[PDB]
Every structure is written in C-alpha cells, then in structure tokens.
Symmetry: D2
Subunit: 248 residues, 4 copies
Amino acid sequence: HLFDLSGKVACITGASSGLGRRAALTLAAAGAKVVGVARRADALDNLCAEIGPAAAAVVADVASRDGLERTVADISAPFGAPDILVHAAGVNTREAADDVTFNGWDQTLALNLSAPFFLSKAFVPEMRKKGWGRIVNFASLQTTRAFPGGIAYGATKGGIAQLTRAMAEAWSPDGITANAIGPGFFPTELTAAVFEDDARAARNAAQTCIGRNGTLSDMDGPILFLCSDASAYVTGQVLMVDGGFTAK
Amino acid sequence: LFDLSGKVACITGASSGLGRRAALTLAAAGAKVVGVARRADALDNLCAEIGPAAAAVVADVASRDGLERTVADISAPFGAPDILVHAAGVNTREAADDVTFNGWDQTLALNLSAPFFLSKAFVPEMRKKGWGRIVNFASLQTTRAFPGGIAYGATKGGIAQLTRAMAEAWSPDGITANAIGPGFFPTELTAAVFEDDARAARNAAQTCIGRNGTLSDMDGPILFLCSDASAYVTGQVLMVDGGFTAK
Amino acid sequence: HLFDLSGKVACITGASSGLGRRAALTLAAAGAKVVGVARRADALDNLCAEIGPAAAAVVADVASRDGLERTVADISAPFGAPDILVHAAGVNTREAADDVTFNGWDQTLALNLSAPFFLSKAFVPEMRKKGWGRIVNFASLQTTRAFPGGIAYGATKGGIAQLTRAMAEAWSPDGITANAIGPGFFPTELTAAVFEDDARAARNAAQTCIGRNGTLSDMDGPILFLCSDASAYVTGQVLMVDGGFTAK
Amino acid sequence: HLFDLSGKVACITGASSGLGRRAALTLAAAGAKVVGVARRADALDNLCAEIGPAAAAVVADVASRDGLERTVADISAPFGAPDILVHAAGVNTREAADDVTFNGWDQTLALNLSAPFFLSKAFVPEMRKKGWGRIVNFASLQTTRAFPGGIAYGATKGGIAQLTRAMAEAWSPDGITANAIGPGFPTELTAAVFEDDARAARNAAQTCIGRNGTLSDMDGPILFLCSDASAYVTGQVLMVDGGFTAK
C-alpha cells in the first residue's frame, strides 16, 4: 500500500549509470512508469530494455538553458507529466581550489544546482494540479565534509541542502514534498576514482559505522521511501544513506 | 524490503500515541510486537486490536532495579526482539527557573538512560543473529528550544549523539541505530499543544506543508527504519515534521 | 594584541553600506589598513573620509569575470596585497520559486557564491607567502532556514557554508583560516524590505532568544574575532550573530 | 574595550588543569577576578599563585547535589556573585557501549550535564539583577561525532548543545548569553590521546590546519564568548578545532 507507485510517473535524470540507473530500476519495480534522462542514447536503451515497456528514454542535456522547454516536452511525452522527479545527474570536476577554472566551476554549478531548480520549476504546475509530487535531490557527504578536490562540488552540494528546504517552503503546501538523499561512497560514475584505489576504498569503508561502502541495492529502500506515500509528512530533509560515515 | 515476517519488535511507551501507532504499523508488516507500558488496560486494548501477534508487558523501563525482569518479560512471549522502538518519554514542562531535582532526574532517567540500558541488554541476541534495528525518538527540541523544555531538550539533544554512538558501537554487527524526530502529533507528550487551538494553528503554519501530523504519517518512516530497506542508514536523525525545521 | 590588526591589510566587499561598511570601520579601528570595494564611488568616499588615511576605495563589480584581474590589481594598489578578506557583498532578488528568472538566479549565484571564491583564490598566494590570512564569508539565517522569496539566495547561502569548509580544507594548512559569519536581521542594504515593515521587524525580534534585532555594533566583536590572531585555531566554521534566532 | 573584563567576576569549574585552568588565566589577564573551582586544593593554589590577587580558589565537587548551596556560597564569597560562568569540569570514563556500568554512566551525566544546569541556575538571579551575564558550556567533537569509548560522554555532549540553546531561550532576554565552546588539546580529558603519538598524528591530520590545539589557541575564543564582544551571540556552539569538523 504505502510504497506502491502504480499509476505514478517518475522522471530520473542521470539515469544511464550508477545511482540514477538503479533509482529508475527501483521505481519501475514499484509500479511506476519511468522516464530516464541522459546525454547518450545507447545506455538509456540498455536500461529501458532491462525495464521493459514501463521505461522510456529521453536524450537531453538538462543543464542546457536553450534545451529546457524541449527537454520538458520530451519527458512529458511517453507517459504524461511526471509526478516524481529524481535529480541524480551531477558532476565533480575534482579541481582543487588553486586549480579551479571558470569552466569547471560553471559546469558544476549549472548541472548540480541550477538544473535541478529549473527542471523542478517546470514540472511543479502539473504536480500542484494533482496536489501530489515528490522531488528527490542528491546531496552528498560533501554537503557537510570537504574532501580533496571538491570545492565547486561541495559548494553545489551545500547549496542543494538549502535549495531542498526552499523548495519545500515554496511547494509543500500543494502536496509536493522535496527531500534530498545523501549517498555515501557507492560504485558510480561520480566515483571509481575512489573505487580504483583499493586502499582509499578501504579507508572510506572503515570510516563508516558499519565498516563497508554502499552497494547499489542499499539505495532501493531510501529512494522508494522518499518517492512514495510513506514519506508524505517528510519534507525539506536530508537523508544520509552512508553506513554511518557522518556519525563518526 | 518492508516485510517484517519472522521479526520480533519491542515498543516502549506502547499504550498511547506514537508508540501505540508504531506497534500497529510493525504488526501490520508481519512482526510480532511486545508493547511495554506501566498500565495494563491500555496495553490489553492494543493487544486486542492487534490479536495474537501482540503481547503486553507491564514495566517501568526507567527503573534500574526493574531492568533484568523487564528484559526477561519482554523476551518471554516471542523470544529476544530484533527491533527496539523507544517511544517512552516525558516532558515535565518545568521552565528553567522552576526546574526541580526530581523533574530533571525523571526526564534524564526515562528519555536518555532508559533507551541506552534497554538497548544494551538486547544487543547480544541481535549480534548473534547479525541483524537489529534500534529507533530512538528525537524531537523538534533536538535542535530548537521551546518554552518549558530545558530538561526535555537536554535529553533530546543527547538522544541524537547517543544514536550516533550506538551506531558506532553496534552497526558493525548488523545493528542499525536511528532516531525518528516527530513534529507535533496528537499524542501523550502533547495535547498541552493540541487542546490549545491557536497554538496548534501556529505550529501547523510553521511547517512547510501547513498542517500538524496525524498518526498515519508515522507508519512509513517507522517501517522504513525498522526493515531491510534501511540497512545502510545508521546513526541518522529523520525528522517527520512537515518541514517545521526547514523554515 | 590577540585583536591587534596593526600591519595587516583588509579588503571588504560591499563596503559602501550596512555590514560591509561597519566591518571596514571595525577593522580600521583595530589598526588595519582597509580597502573598501563597491560599485559607486561617492559612498566609498564618504566612508574613507570617516576613516581617514588608513582607508582606500576601489570601485569595482566584484561579480564581473572580465573585471577580476583589474579588480584585484586595484585592491592591491594602495597598501599592497591584503591579509584579510571580508566578503560582505550580496544580493537577494526576493523572487519566489515560481517567479524566478534566469537573470535573477544567475546574478544571485554570480555575486553570492562565485565572486567570493574567485576573489579569495586571486588573493590566497600572497597570504600563503606570508603564511597568514583571514577569509570571512557571510552566511545567513537562510543558510539553514527557508524564508519567503529566498530560494536563489538560500541556495547560495547554503553553498557558502560548504564553500567556507572547502576553503578551510584547501588553504588552512598555509595559515589561512576561512570562516563564515551569519548575521541575523540588521538594518542593512539586504534587509530594508524587512526592517521597513514594523510588524515584521517585531516578529523577527520576538523569534530571537534576546528579544531584539541586531544593531551594527553587534557585528564589531565577531568580525574582529574572525579577522585576528584570536581565531587562529577556528577554521571552517559558521558563527551565527543572530540573538539566538537559530536556537529557537 | 570590547574584550575588557575589568569589574567582572568569573567562576571557572575544572580550573585546576587543562582548559579550565587556561580559561582562568585568560579571563584574569583580561582584568576579571576569577574563582577557580576544583576538588583538590593544591593545584588550585598553584593556579592562584600564578595569577596573583585577582584569583581565589574554591574546593568543591560541583556534581554534588548536597554540596550545591555551599558551593555557591563559597564561589560568591571572595569577590561577590560571578558575572561569568565557565563550565570546564567534565569526565570521560571511556567505557565502550557493551562495558558501560551504572556508576560510570551516572557520573558522566551528573558532572557533564546536570552540574552545569544547576550551577548556572543558582547563579542566574544575580546576573539578571545586573542585566548582564555570560555562560560558557563545553561542547566537544563528540557533540556530533562518535569516537571509540565515548557513548556516555557523547550523550552528555550532544545534550550540552541543546542545553545551551535552552539556556539561551530561558535567560538571554535578561542579558545572559549562553554559548558552548567545542575544543578539538593536551588536557586532563585527552591525555590517553596525547600519550599515543600515532593517534595524536592522525588526529592532527584530520584537522584542516594540520595540527592539534595548544592551550593558547583557546585564549581568543574564551575571551570572545565571555565579554561585551559577543552580546548578540547566544545559543551557539563555537568549535575551536582547526577544522576537524569541516573535513
């Protein structure tokens, strides 16, 4: 009952790899129709093949300002206006502070901070008409903890926390909750610089309370929790899925 | 992911409000539940509503002399619990300049010491199973000081770090520890709030949604934290407060 | 002595009004040479007259990318490279979520988040050569609490918190601390829509623990604290100067 | 003049070693009369000799409930009622979760959480009459981060954060601010860390700066929180930790 997503439409950005891909899998398994958004078709088609006819694929650069109107139309085309929006697209350039370039900084802010806001803003009117909506932003361990090479990334992930609260303040009266999941270290696109260094992966695993890094299945429950009726009275929260990394 | 069949849950403070609803939700997910309270008749009402998956234990969980039998009695109907929900609490409402030794000590004993020593008693059987769930109850007064709440706030800020410490100690053994932080619900700890209509209206307007909680709001979060779905969530405070803290 | 700034140079952005202006006054009174930065000359000239020969004025748009190199040269010209950097320039467009424009959003991000980073980055090398530096960013109550009309502003002020932590992680090994001061409600450039409405000012005053809004003098001690030897082992922190607004 | 404490009286608990001792030196150097509180007279006498005639020493167990009235009288005797209260007394028993004893837990709560509240409560009326007061509590890295062996300690240090906020909500309308300094230091309370060279080295590398604290690091912060400079800072935790918490 509470975690059933039948009759719901979800859009997932960054859906061609890692956490966005698994999020699309989990929401589809819960009965949702899913629209995966990514830059490159071929991985989106792989994902859609794994899911079947409940999955549609949209190729788009969600950071592109010119593209926004068409991106929104294409997302809405297969299954109608989405009820659920999971913003798993992100980038970490890994430029340390004294090496940051204008372009690395600007691309990080455009994808991690500006894109989730303008995409959500485009989709809110239909959610408000329905009186029901779920926005899941992606926070980070660098929402609160500065790691080497993460200054732009950290800026945007600290931004995502207050942005999530702001979206709640603006839109939760209309039945749209806005929360942010903060994964720890998972084998994803945005890692593997970490998961190629066996020793660093071991340190990171030892920093958690549990003593291990995440596996993709770890995100199934949290994603479902935040995207369903179960979380109706949870809004404007950061939920860390990190094995206790932040508790130590 | 959310199936609790084959699991045993103990809920303290189970005779009213949020603890009662937690027992209902966990039983509905297939768990055997043991409700703990001081008062038998409300516990039996709860057990009647649930049926044979529910047992009732009468105990003062703050009593140090009582700890061993409280633990034995909880373990008796269904075996050692896998899930522990510490929903027992007190707010004496003594403002700072009116705080008494007894009110302070009763707040610390029930809200802070009791969840620790009860969890400690139950951790060995969870570790032998390699699986366990601890849910503490945090509060809006974990971070926000309200009139008359100084002792209560002390213990609820304490509960946050205590939950982290429980995670650090026990999560390597498959025992997660998290704290759920309700906003304003009609419960035992409230009705000083909810029988004052204007105050309830102000509190509702302080949330992002614009309403106070209903008991059903807590079903999903509780089950989320008590099930396989939250295996990699530990040492966290999850506010269930309609955005009260977001504003 | 702990609070003596003799021989130090401070640059303060947003120096022509409100908190930036008062910060310049406080640092000059502690013995520092100060360079006030603002858009229009006449107010900076007033401030310099009040301070006297320890004050210099630089007219610049610190958000301008083209302007950054000469902005930095002009700041460095009167007294040499600054040791202390106080980023009090900011904007709040007050556009609510469903009214946000590209231009309002981009201008908020450019001034509130990108400007402090690239300005600090330009000045860090001389601080590192001296082995001593103070960076003070301006956080906000909207670093953690969403207010009506503040979604862009809040995004950047949540960003400023993690950015301050990231600056600490990058530069504090070289003797440069980075902290963020978080004013509550003061009568300033950014709050007069707020201080302009007597009832709203009274509500905000009642939300503090003390029971009053800030006066400019309230910022003197904290600013000095964060800019002096007294704070040598404080870095990557947010210090709220808000009468307990956040405690309730 | 913002940081001048001439004409003010400060009481520092735990004043015979480490951070309380350094706090007493700092406040005295800023012109305050200081009363050092400790259990053993002789270290207090050393401190008083170093300070000179601005220092008085009081022997007391600030966790003692019976002793409270007399402790307060003795603190007030040499220089009058204090304007500044610095609660540097604390204990960390270092008992891990499965080893906690009733006595270790009770002594941690009694000293670290209950003592600061009841001592502050005893002294606030005279501060309120003056319309001016400073309360400095000691938070900790374990206010937010669980370290091995710190479960009781962490409970009390998370508690101190909300207790500080509650003290602000109760007493800041009368001119009494209440803040907590959270040191990341060679002290009484950390020598198990500083007698292990490798542990000190990781701890130093975990900070942003790359070093552990020296006692002098606390001079500016203590003064900041104890003076006119911080009139509009209340209910805050100020970490003095080299960026330990930023990473």
